[PDB]
Design a protein around this ligand. Sequence first.
Ligand SMILES: CC(=O)N[C@@H]1[C@@H](O)[C@H](O)[C@@H](CO)O[C@@H]1CP(=O)(O)OP(=O)(O)OC[C@H]1O[C@@H](n2ccc(=O)[nH]c2=O)[C@H](O)[C@@H]1O
Ligand SMILES: [Mn+2]
Length: 342
Amino acid sequence: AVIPILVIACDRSTVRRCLDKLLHYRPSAELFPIIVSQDCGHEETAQVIASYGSAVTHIRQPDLSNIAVQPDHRKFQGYYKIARHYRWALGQIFHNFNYPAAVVVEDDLEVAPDFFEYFQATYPLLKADPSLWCVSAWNDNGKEQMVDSSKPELLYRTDFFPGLGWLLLAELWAELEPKWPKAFWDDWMRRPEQRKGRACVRPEISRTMTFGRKGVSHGQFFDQHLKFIKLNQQFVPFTQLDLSYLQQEAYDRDFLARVYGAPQLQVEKVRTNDRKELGEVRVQYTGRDSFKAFAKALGVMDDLKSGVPRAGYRGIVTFLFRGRRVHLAPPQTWDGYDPSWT
Ligand SMILES: CC(=O)N[C@@H]1[C@@H](O)[C@H](O)[C@@H](CO)O[C@@H]1CP(=O)(O)OP(=O)(O)OC[C@H]1O[C@@H](n2ccc(=O)[nH]c2=O)[C@H](O)[C@@H]1O
Ligand SMILES: [Mn+2]
């Protein structure tokens, strides 16, 4: 199966950093053709992409007109342009080139040495399990002190769509295109009407890292969070590993049994590093306020999209804190997300 890498670009010449790493690590030009879709028309960026010659296929979004935004969105024209470009580019991949799947990579992402190996290994899982709707290279809680460097091979399921280096099947584009939004496509994906209870595979250590401090947005989120996401540098031969543990049946039984079988500790004890003999614990939250309070106390992301926490799975956020494995989890009676948890 051929899995193209669709690179989304606009007006940053640093797309060079992105393409250099993709081309350096690519194991096969035939199995992983690179298609660079460029919006905007920025001449210098176009010349940079063109300089790679036949190593990539350069396509150009055709409609460079301004978009009529709704009354609440005067400040957000750029987000409307991002959504328009995604719809056109994905249409080229799935309707024109007619590929079976694709890995979407924004121009300000640097990939890890095992980026291709990771997607090659997980594609069959995505094809076989309809409860999965994507595979992502991104760990939303992937800061250095929050991940286990001794387990670069460990993967998880997450209900929180991460994007930022992600694989989708042509089958999913068939479902999304007819209702593609005018703006904020990532948060639109995160809504239950789109997600329909499906999960993505995500890693313990991220296979992408963004360097786009300057972009469409204000550098706030980048400066406070994104810049700290660690890029994996230890090559893991995922295609040689047994990933059967990620199938829904196995995961929902074993991973959940692991989380709820682990000893419970009060957040304060985890914070101060008490009871260190307990290498894996559960910190229970019971409502929106306690979730946010406990997430912040332990240094993890505390925002929610449609009621789902960053990297959460059945409400559980899993990470490392001062060397200890911690599962910030709801009571075992959990039965669905509440979008009102904002
Ligand atoms: C870290 C993070 O979560 N970033 C997400 C991004 O993944 C997502 O797609 C976007 C959806 O609203 O929200 C932010 C944007 P954010 O990450 O803040 O901003 P940017 O990198 O500038 O833009 C995202 C992508 O859109 C492209 N672009 C930009 C301007 C334009 O007119 N046309 C165009 O196609 C860029 O080349 C880039 O590939
Ligand atoms: Mn960006």
